């Protein structure tokens, strides 16, 4: 099939053919609004890998995120605390820029459900991502047993709670000795269980 | 003020109909502890807010 070629071709983002397309797209995406619907996926292969299926109910928004770190929003620097906290400039956000993208596309279209996102191009000031949305009230989505899990109310705003693939990575969870500080549900689940006196009845 | 709004005038209407003493026959009821109206507002002492 052709999807293997398209996949392995997108693994050559330095080649001349790819460097041309990326700079051409990144030019065109820079002329549109920060958040606008795309008619079809620009990366059909990546979309299918992430769960997109070409059928009524799947929506794709391409949104733009300003690159760079996060500076502490305090007036003129003034962090009236101890010197350990005077940092204003080289601070980094705890969540990826892709996860910020999934959030902004999900907050705008509250009726839809964020599924996944992927990288489609960047420059010195912008990263462009294409988020895959699903309309959980379309009968093509509602009547399909394979995808009707997204319709359940527990998956309202997966991106706001950090449950998408891009959002999960910032939570630092996984199996093994590298991820001890999130044993339990999450980083707060571990902290509670470890800072709770279990005062038994008989001690 | 002589220049009022309909919101204000209707509001002052309520606070005026509430300023009456309790009727005589209520403390003839069985489980009645009320002796008199404890929310009587006098226009010169309590100034109704606003």
């Amino acid at each position: 099939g052709a999807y293997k070629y398209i996949q392995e071709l997108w693994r050559k983002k330095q080649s001349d053919v790819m460097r041309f397309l990326l700079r051409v797209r990144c030019w065109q995406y820079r002329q549109l609004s920060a958040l606008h619907r795309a008619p079809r996926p620009t990366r059909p292969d990546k979309a299918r890998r992430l769960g997109y299926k070409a059928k009524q109910g799947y929506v794709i928004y391409r949104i733009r995120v300003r690159r760079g770190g996060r500076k502490r929003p305090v007036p003129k620097g003034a962090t009236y605390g101890k010197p350990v906290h005077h940092g204003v400039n080289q601070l980094k956000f705890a969540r990826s820029l892709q996860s910020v993208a999934e959030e902004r596309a999900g907050r705008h279209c509250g009726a839809l459900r964020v599924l996944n996102s992927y990288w489609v191009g960047e420059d010195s000031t912008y990263k462009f991502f294409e988020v895959i949305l699903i309309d959980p009230f379309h009968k093509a989505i509602r009547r399909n047993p394979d995808t009707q899990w997204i319709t359940k109310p527990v998956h309202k705003h997966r991106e706001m709670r950090g449950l998408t693939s891009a959002g999960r990575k910032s939570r630092g969870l996984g199996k093994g000795h590298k991820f001890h500080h999130t044993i339990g549900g999450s980083r707060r689940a571990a902290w509670r269980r470890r800072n709770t006196l279990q005062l038994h009845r008989y001690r | 003020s002589s220049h009022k709004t309909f919101r204000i005038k209707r509001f002052l209407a309520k606070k005026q109909k509430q300023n009456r003493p309790i009727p005589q026959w209520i403390w003839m009821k069985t489980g009645n502890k009320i002796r008199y109206n404890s929310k009587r507002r006098h226009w010169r002492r309590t100034k109704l807010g606003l």
Binding site: - | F6, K9, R10, L12, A13, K14, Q16, K17
Partner: protein
């Protein structure tokens, strides 16, 4: 086909009318301000009677929502009489009082006896 003006304006597109496949609400809400809800009761104060014999008017406590137009057609329909003009004010207690001046061919003093106030 040429552009005489240097500006581009959004062309006028056809826009249809609502053709709903079902009424949003089952049945129209019945009017809760009919003629009987407008006129609550007339007044029997010493100034109200004084207003009847002299100026040939009737004094009513109408609902606070009614207009002079609704009040005029209410008394015209409840008591089968003709009205010259209606003056309304909102009492300090809250309800709306309406001075209804009858047309000269009707004597308000007898009209008050049909409705009972005297």
């Amino acid at each position: 086909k040429i552009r005489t003006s240097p500006t581009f304006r959004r062309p006028k597109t056809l826009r249809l009318r609502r053709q709903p496949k079902y009424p949003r609400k089952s049945a129209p809400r019945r009017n809760k301000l009919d003629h009987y809800a407008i006129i609550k009761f007339p007044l029997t104060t010493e100034s109200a009677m004084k207003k009847i014999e002299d100026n040939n008017t009737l004094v009513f406590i109408v609902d606070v929502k009614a207009n002079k137009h609704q009040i005029k057609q209410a008394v015209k329909k409840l008591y089968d009489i003709d009205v010259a003009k209606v003056n309304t004010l909102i009492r300090p207690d809250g309800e709306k009082k309406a001075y209804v001046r009858l047309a000269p061919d009707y004597d308000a003093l007898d009209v008050a006896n049909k409705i009972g106030i005297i």
